Design an enzyme around this catalytic site. Structure first.
Site: not given
Ligand SMILES: CNC(=O)CN1CCC(Nc2nccc(-c3cnc4ccccn34)n2)CC1
Length: 332
Positions: A30, A145
């Site tokens: 990303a 995360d």
């Protein structure tokens, strides 16, 4: 002449040093496109990650800078090592892209998830995953995360963590995974070291059920899936939830907690021997200690490392200021 060269690998030009040859697109994240290549100097395969204008916005900037420093300083056997960093540009004015070179791994935990594994390997990967997180926490870093796509492995079962977690609006067309985020995060209740244990637990479960434990379109559908299988948290948990957040949670349809032997029967675990039978109960036990909603009652990293199932291996800058920070970090 020119110390570099450029080849087209998809839709974005990869301009790298002569030493790296035979580029092969292995993936995309990303924030950057990744390529596998041969490093003539070291005589081995490596992975190259390209960051296009990492100073375009606060989000990409804060992340590229953060990674560029940590992946540089912090070093651990279970945390992807940096082999080299470079940029084909010659000055700050021209500065554009940053290339990250690291050891080439074989695959993602996503591919490992799509396959049945023995207790020897599953517990080993889990052991290394905890070592990394341990080192991270000791370094004053709490990922928050962790997910299958950020953890890579090799054919010999070696495991390493990729990024370093969070520290926010982007025109980016792609969403971020939220399935592995801890209750605290999903409800912003403040957190601590053991917040990553939840991520680990969601991953271990998926390696068992071979399916995402708590899927969802948003944190709303996400929380339901959590209370559906684990059941509404104890009343003492809500007293730690903001008055606004608590309301929403307490006014949610209460549920009963499905036992763990239910969520994870034996058809998912190998039991063709007394060894696997026992390992199954130990594996299912750890799950019930990590997959706990209330942090106060969730097992820690050092305890999970003691588990018998695992111990068998014992700021605000502008786009111009950021470009500056990142550039100098590149060229020491
Ligand atoms: C056979 N495996 C696959 O289908 C995908 N894998 C993922 C890991 C990759 N190897 C590797 N080794 C080191 C760093 C990175 C990497 C670093 N950032 C990213 C983002 C997306 C995909 C890969 N990476 N990737 C090889 C292909």
């Amino acid at each position: 002449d020119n110390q570099f060269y450029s080849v087209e690998v998809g839709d974005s030009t990869f301009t790298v040093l002569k030493r790296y040859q035979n580029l092969k697109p292995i993936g995309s994240g990303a924030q950057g496109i990744v390529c596998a290549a041969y490093d003539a100097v070291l005589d081995r395969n490596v992975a190259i990650k390209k960051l296009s204008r990492p100073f375009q916005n606060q989000t990409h900037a804060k992340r590229a800078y953060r990674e560029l420093v940590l992946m540089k300083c912090v070093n651990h056997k279970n945390i992807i090592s940096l082999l080299n960093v470079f940029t084909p540009q010659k000055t700050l004015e021209e500065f554009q892209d940053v290339y990250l070179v690291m050891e080439l791994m074989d695959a993602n935990l996503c591919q490992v998830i799509q396959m049945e594994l023995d207790h020897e390997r599953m517990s080993y990967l889990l052991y290394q995953m905890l070592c990394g997180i341990k080192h991270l926490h000791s370094a004053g870093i709490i990922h928050r995360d962790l997910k299958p796509s950020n953890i890579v492995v090799k054919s010999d079962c070696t495991l390493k963590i990729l990024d370093f977690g969070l520290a926010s609006f982007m025109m980016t067309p792609y969403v971020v995974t939220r399935y592995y985020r801890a209750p605290e995060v999903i409800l912003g209740m403040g957190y601590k070291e053991n917040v990553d244990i939840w991520s680990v637990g969601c991953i271990m479960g998926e390696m068992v059920r071979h399916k995402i434990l708590f899927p969802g379109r948003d944190y709303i559908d996400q929380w339901n899936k959590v209370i559906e299988q684990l059941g509404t948290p104890c009343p003492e948990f809500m007293k730690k939830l903001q008055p606004t957040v608590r309301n929403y949670v307490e006014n949610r349809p209460k549920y009963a907690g499905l036992t763990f032997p239910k969520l994870f029967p034996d058809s998912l675990f190998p039991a063709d021997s007394e060894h696997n039978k026992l390992k199954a109960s130990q594996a299912r036990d750890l799950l019930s200690k990590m997959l706990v909603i209330d942090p106060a009652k969730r097992i820690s990293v050092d305890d999970a490392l003691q588990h018998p199932y695992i111990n068998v291996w014992y700021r605000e800058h502008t786009i111009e200021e950021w470009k500056e920070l990142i550039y100098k970090e590149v060229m020491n």
